Amino acid sequence: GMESKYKEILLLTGLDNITDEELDRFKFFLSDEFNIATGKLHTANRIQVATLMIQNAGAVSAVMKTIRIFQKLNYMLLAKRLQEEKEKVDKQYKS
Amino acid sequence: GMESKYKEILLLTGLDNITDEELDRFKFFLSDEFNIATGKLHTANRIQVATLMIQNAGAVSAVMKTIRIFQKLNYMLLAKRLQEEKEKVDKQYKS
Amino acid sequence: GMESKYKEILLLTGLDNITDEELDRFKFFLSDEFNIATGKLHTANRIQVATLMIQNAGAVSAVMKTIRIFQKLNYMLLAKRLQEEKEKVDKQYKS
Amino acid sequence: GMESKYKEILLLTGLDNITDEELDRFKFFLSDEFNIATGKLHTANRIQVATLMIQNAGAVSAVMKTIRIFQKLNYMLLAKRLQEEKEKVDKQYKS
Amino acid sequence: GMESKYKEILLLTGLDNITDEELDRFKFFLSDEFNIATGKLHTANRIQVATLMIQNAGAVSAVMKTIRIFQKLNYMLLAKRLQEEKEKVDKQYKS
Amino acid sequence: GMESKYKEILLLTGLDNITDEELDRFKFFLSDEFNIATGKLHTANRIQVATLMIQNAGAVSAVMKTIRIFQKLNYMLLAKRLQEEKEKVDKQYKS
Amino acid sequence: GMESKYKEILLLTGLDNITDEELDRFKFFLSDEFNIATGKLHTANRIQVATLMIQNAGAVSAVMKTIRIFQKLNYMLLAKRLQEEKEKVDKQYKS
Amino acid sequence: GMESKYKEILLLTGLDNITDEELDRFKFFLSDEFNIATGKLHTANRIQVATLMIQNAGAVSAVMKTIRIFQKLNYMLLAKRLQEEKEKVDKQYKS
Amino acid sequence: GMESKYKEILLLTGLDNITDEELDRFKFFLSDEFNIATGKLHTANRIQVATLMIQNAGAVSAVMKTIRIFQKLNYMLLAKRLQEEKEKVDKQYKS
Amino acid sequence: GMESKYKEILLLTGLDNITDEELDRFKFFLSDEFNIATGKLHTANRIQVATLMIQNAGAVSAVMKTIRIFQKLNYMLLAKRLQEEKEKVDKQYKS
Amino acid sequence: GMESKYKEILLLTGLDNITDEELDRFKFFLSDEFNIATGKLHTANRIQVATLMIQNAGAVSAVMKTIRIFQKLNYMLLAKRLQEEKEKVDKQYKS
Amino acid sequence: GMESKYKEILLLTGLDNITDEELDRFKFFLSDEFNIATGKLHTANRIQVATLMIQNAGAVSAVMKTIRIFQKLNYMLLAKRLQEEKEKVDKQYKS
Amino acid sequence: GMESKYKEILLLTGLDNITDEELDRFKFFLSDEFNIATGKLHTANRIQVATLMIQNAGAVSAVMKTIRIFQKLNYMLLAKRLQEEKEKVDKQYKS
Amino acid sequence: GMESKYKEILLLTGLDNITDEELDRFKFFLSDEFNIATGKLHTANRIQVATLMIQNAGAVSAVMKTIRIFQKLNYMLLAKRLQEEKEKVDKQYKS
Amino acid sequence: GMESKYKEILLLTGLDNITDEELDRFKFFLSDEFNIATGKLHTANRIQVATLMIQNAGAVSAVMKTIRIFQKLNYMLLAKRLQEEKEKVDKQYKS
Amino acid sequence: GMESKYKEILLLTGLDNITDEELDRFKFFLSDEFNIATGKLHTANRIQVATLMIQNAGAVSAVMKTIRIFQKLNYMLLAKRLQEEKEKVDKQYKS
Amino acid sequence: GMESKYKEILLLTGLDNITDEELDRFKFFLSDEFNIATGKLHTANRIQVATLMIQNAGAVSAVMKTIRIFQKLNYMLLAKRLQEEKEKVDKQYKS
Amino acid sequence: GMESKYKEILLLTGLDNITDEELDRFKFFLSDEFNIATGKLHTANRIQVATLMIQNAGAVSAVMKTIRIFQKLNYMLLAKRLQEEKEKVDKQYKS
Amino acid sequence: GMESKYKEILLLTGLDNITDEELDRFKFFLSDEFNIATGKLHTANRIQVATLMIQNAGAVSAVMKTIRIFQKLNYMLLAKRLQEEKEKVDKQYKS
Amino acid sequence: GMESKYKEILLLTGLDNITDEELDRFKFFLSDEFNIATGKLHTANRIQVATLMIQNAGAVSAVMKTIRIFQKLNYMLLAKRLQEEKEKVDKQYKS
Amino acid sequence: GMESKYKEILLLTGLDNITDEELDRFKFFLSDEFNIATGKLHTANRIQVATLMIQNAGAVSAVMKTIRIFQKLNYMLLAKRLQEEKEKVDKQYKS
């Protein structure tokens, strides 16, 4: 169930709140944290980006490295919100 | 039929009468009343904004929260007009 | 033959004269007059919109409800032109 | 007959009213409610999605979990409409 | 001879005018009107679908239930055309 | 007579409702429940598959293990339908 | 002479109109109505099947049980046609 | 010799120019013009179809009813070509 | 000499032009026109079939009942050819 | 040879010079001039459209009705070019 | 009389229900249970096989070893049926 | 070749020399000289405007009516230049 | 020896190079050139076809009429090759 | 050997370098140069197309008419390449 | 029983969760781990791929090398899931 | 008795588990291990193949060379299963 | 090799250096130099434009007419650069 | 033994690694290297193709001409692999 | 003794290695080398064929003409093997 | 093993990192380095492109010419990365 | 890791701090330092500009030539900041 909650955190809170140019910055910094080939990243939307991130690193490190890339882009609000949702889920299932 | 009348109130009277900068203020205050992800709000036009509002909260609370956000922006004329159209429709179908 | 004339009225006079944003308003008000599922309306062009309207309500009520939706959008010129073409065809075949 | 009515609710009201990107979000959240292998979900259309949902969980829990996934995606209008149609059918055959 | 005319109505007017996705919707709603096993419906074309419908319910109830399923799919134009052809044949041989 | 009813359940309800790829999955899981040599399973159709299953395990355990393999393939609808038909026949002749 | 007419009904109308897979379904359901050993049914053609049916139950119960097995296979058209030919012969010689 | 020329017209001009799906439509409309049992039509190729048509109605009415069925399928080009070849042969031997 | 000509008509034109399955249909319908015991018909070839037909009914009624059985099997071409050869011989010796 | 020249006029000059949306308008107006079932028109390309037009009305009336439909779509340049090529071929072979 | 009943069990229930390839498997496993020379088994039919089995081991051990060879071939249905008939005869005459 | 020269006159001299607001005036006066649907004019650039003008009236009347619309907008310099280029081409090819 | 060379031409070059469907076309056109009864042609292979052709018309007219039937089937390559081999043998023994 | 070189020219240089839509144009223009029945052309691939062309006109006129059809489709590069390879082979064996 | 559990792991968890393009990558990397001839891999589906893998290396090394190839394709989620299911089965039967 | 057990291993485990194409590969590699004339191998089934192998090399070397040929065909699963059954029988009778 | 160098000149130097609106001007002037149907030009990118130009006129006249069209559009810099690269290649291979 | 090794090279390495369309190209080029009649090549599989090649030219020239035909089809990898296996066998037995 | 060795060469190596269709080709070419009446060849098996060949020409010319007929059928492998065995026997007894 | 490493370099590092338009440029420059027919390149994806490159030139020259084509497209980063991976593998296995 | 740090320097410090007109000056001076085709530069944003710079020259020379172009534009502050970040990274990883 923690997989599903990290899917909702990653897609619904994280990727849905960034704009299109911010999505292009995010795809510009995916290849330095994930070892994902950029040739399918180049035209992906938010759902395919979440599918490549969860598929290529797991949901836990997908959300954690999403926080890391959002801190690379100086998006302190969204990184703070993903840490709040992530700690609510870690409180939810790790306790 | 009340759904269609609230669609005409929301799009035709409400959103079509605000300008582009006023639309950007409106999108700036959508996220505090609707729980809509802003990443698709950022480049939406009036029709897509009405589609996200009606889709994400229903037409009744969409128009009512439109009145509320227009009162947050001190647009007393448009909020008064949406209350007039809304009470004409509530008189039309609720009686 | 009246089917073909109402096809020419609907596509050639009606839908071809509205712009793209006006087409999006038109698709925003199709679901309140036609019981058409919007999931295929969302990316349709004018030909597919005319195909769904004629397919889902017939050409006669398709053109008549096109006049009705154009009067919902306050497009009095195009609604007047569709009534002129529609009465020329009704004069043509109904007499 | 309740199977057929839940088929009409699921395909006609539920899946036909969501767009293509919303369908991709829906497929992104099918695997957390259904235990359906995603490799055939990835290129399915609405009919094949309804066939996998009804085939893999039954029509009743298919429509009920459709309401649940639509509430995960914050689609309160479509979830409300599926609850209205579902309660009309449960009133129709359960009474 | 009425069998042959209902074959021409069913295949030529009815099934040949629906598209491929509409054929998949039609096959999705065959099992609720015909008691036909879907395992051979899944890859059938229009001719094999007409053969299973006429074979499994007769041509008269095949065309009549084709009108019924087309009214389930909100295809009012094709259902109206099948009622026009069906009443021309019933006028042709029943009178 | 119970042999004939389980033949109608197995062939008519069970095997006729699965598609061709689902039949290939079913043949892929026959060898783990039946001790049937796969060399004649590889090109069999539904009738020859039913003949090898009834011939190699009897009709009762053929239908019961059909329910078991359909539950291995997560086909809850068809397994539920075979349990409904099987309990109608067990009610029919065992009572 | 009624024997010859039931031979023409059974072979010419009944068995010649079913296909090869339908013939295999028919042979799959012969053993539940006729007490015929299946070891010679397995490779028979339509003429040998008619010879075993007429030889093992008579032509009258052969055609009547052919109608019964065709109603087991949901072949309502062919069962209706065999009842029409059978009642034309029973009208022909029984009156 | 007219038999051989109508064989060349039927097989070489008529049946060889229709595709496979058009052949299945043709077999779907053979049973309404020829009184041929469909159970051997179902898997026949063009040569066996020509053999059943010439065998069951003669070559002259075989080609003439081929023109009639091609006009049922709205194949005006092939029906026109078969009338041209048929009138060249009737000019060839009838004069 | 008319006996020899009807032998050539029966064996050379009639029985040699039907195939093996058509020969089995012919043997299936010999017992209704000839009062021939089928136990020697079951493995006969065309020459032994002609010997039993000419031996058991004479050559004239053998060829005439061959035309009758070929019209029972809807073989209008071969029945027409046997009537043409039979009328050439009846013209040859009866005039 | 005039058939081949009208094929080159129809495919090479006529259909190859219209764009994809213009092809969809053309398919939208094929059903009013040709009695072609639209269910195969819906996904056809230019070659299959030319095959259905030449197959269903002949090449001469195919090109002439192509000029007529291009004049329905106000494509005066392409209709003028098809009349120029058509009159060059009619000058070529009719004189 | 028990000899005759075991003859009816062996030939009528046992050997008549196996197919030709199953008969060849049965002959392939006769030489390991009966000490029968295979040179006359190689072209025998079911009657000659039953004659060699009853002649070479008696009817009782013929039927019992038939059950044993059918259990070698995993034919649990036919072995179960031969045990049912064998126990009906042993109940019939041994009690 | 005169078609190409009028294309160079229309696009290169005529439409490329007017500004964006002048292009919007030009599109505002296209519908009174060309019978072009304005819904695609509304967002066209100079190349698409030239394509709709040449496509919908030919190059000769396209350039001549371009001169006429430029004289409606009081653009005497550009209308004079298009008459100079047009008379250089008419001198070039008409003499 | 010319008989043997025409046997090698007919079987080895002619009949061995045509496929199975082409062999069925060839058998479909044997009866118009050879007066061979088709009832043994229907299941013959290439060797039996060559035996009936050489037996029923001689090897010389067998190969020459093979060229003629191959020219009826528009097989210009194989007819050209049989004319080349036939003229090599006629050069070989006729000179 | 010239046959083999023209096979390599036709298949390897000619047909392998055209795409799928270009192959459909090529099949659309085969019937005007070859007298090949289109019913087997409709689903052929490049190898079967080369087999029908070489089989129905020889390799020399097959390649030469391939150049002619490629010049009908304005494929000057591939027609030039086939003329270069064809003249290299004609230089190779004709000199 | 461990064979059956590794079949369910390989087909149900492993191959059913990868998409079609991912299946083509998987087939692209089968030949480097299995010594399987690719000529039958090229058009196989998931069931035939699982049959060739289990047939050509056993189920244990089939699943283990499936994990290895999924780690070659950087599919860490599916490789982790196959290691979880594989260790649940090794815990299930190895302990 | 070891002869009978190796017969059950060879036919039941070995040859019955390979498919038809795998049987043709097996027959393709029989002649390199057995000195069996292939002219009777070419149309044999599994029982006749087992009869020629046991007849021509004995059951022990028949099963052992079956393992060897299955290892030539890279069928490691079936070769492993035949070694398991062979070592169970060698444990059974050699100890 | 000169073909490859003119491909690099045309795509890399010529078409890659023009913008999107300049590409639309270029496509607007392709039809006056190439006899290319514009219906596939309308949505092509630079690679498909280069493929249609090289395919429809050869690489040499493709680059030379590219220089000519660039001089029609007054692009003296790019036409000068294509003449410089073209003369470097003509110096490279023509000397 | 060299015959067996060249059989394993030809079937296992050579023909099993080419796909089905590549097999059809291979059969298209067999007739230019082997003097094999194509009428049995047309429906052969890889085993029958290897049987005709080894039967009609020997295994040594079969593998060597397989390398030659694979170099005609530009399959440098498979031709290189067959030369590697062929030189391993020639090293194995020729030294 | 040379008679016996040529019997073993002819029957065991030569005739036993050809298939049934190849035996029919061989019988088709026996009459051109042996002056054997074909009426007993038509149903002979390999042993009776060897008996007629050795009886009608001696064993030496029987084997030598067997090589000659196998070279007529392009069976270079079997002709080479018969020459190898024949030269081993001629080395065995002639030296 | 070097073949597998160059497969991983070519597909995983090289082709997966280029986008779709870059893939179309790559396919535009494949025909100048590989002698691959472009008709199957035109719709290939990255896996089929890698299969044609490795199949048509080997993996070593496939990767090396991939570096060469990437240097033709000025992709210095990807060419540098393929040289780094290629030298890591050449260090891995060549040392 | 130095690649990622130079990506953050180039995009985050360098390109994000210049305005839109300064970005147009930067694109105006990219073609003199990078050999990048300007046709895709013309509408690129900062992310696509960074992708073309890093893709076309590497990250190190991308940042260094960014400093060089910023010194061409007299942007001494941003060039100084990029030298400070670049020397912090060169201190970070080069020491």
Residue numbers in the entry:
A (entry chain K), B (entry chain R), C (entry chain L), D (entry chain E), E (entry chain B), F (entry chain G), ...: 1 to 95
Show sentences the authors wrote.
Cryo-EM images showed that AIM2PYD filaments are straight helical rods. The resolution of the final model was 3.2 Å according to the gold standard method. As seen from the ASCPYD filament, each AIM2PYD subunit contributes three unique protein–protein interaction interfaces. The type 1a:1b interface is largely composed of side-chain interactions, while the type 2a:2b and type 3a:3b interfaces involved both side-chain and backbone interactions.
AIM2 (absent in melanoma 2) is a bipartite protein composed of the N-terminal PYD followed by the dsDNA-binding HIN domain (hematopoietic interferon-inducible nuclear antigen). The upstream PYD filaments then nucleate the filamentation of the PYD of central adaptor ASC (ASCPYD), leading to the oligomerization of the CARD of ASC (ASCCARD) to recruit and trigger the polymerization (activation) of procaspase-1 (ASC: apoptosis-associated speck-forming protein containing caspase-recruiting domain (CARD); CARDs are also six-helix bundles that belong to the DD family). AIM2 is essential for the host defense against numerous pathogenic viruses and bacteria.
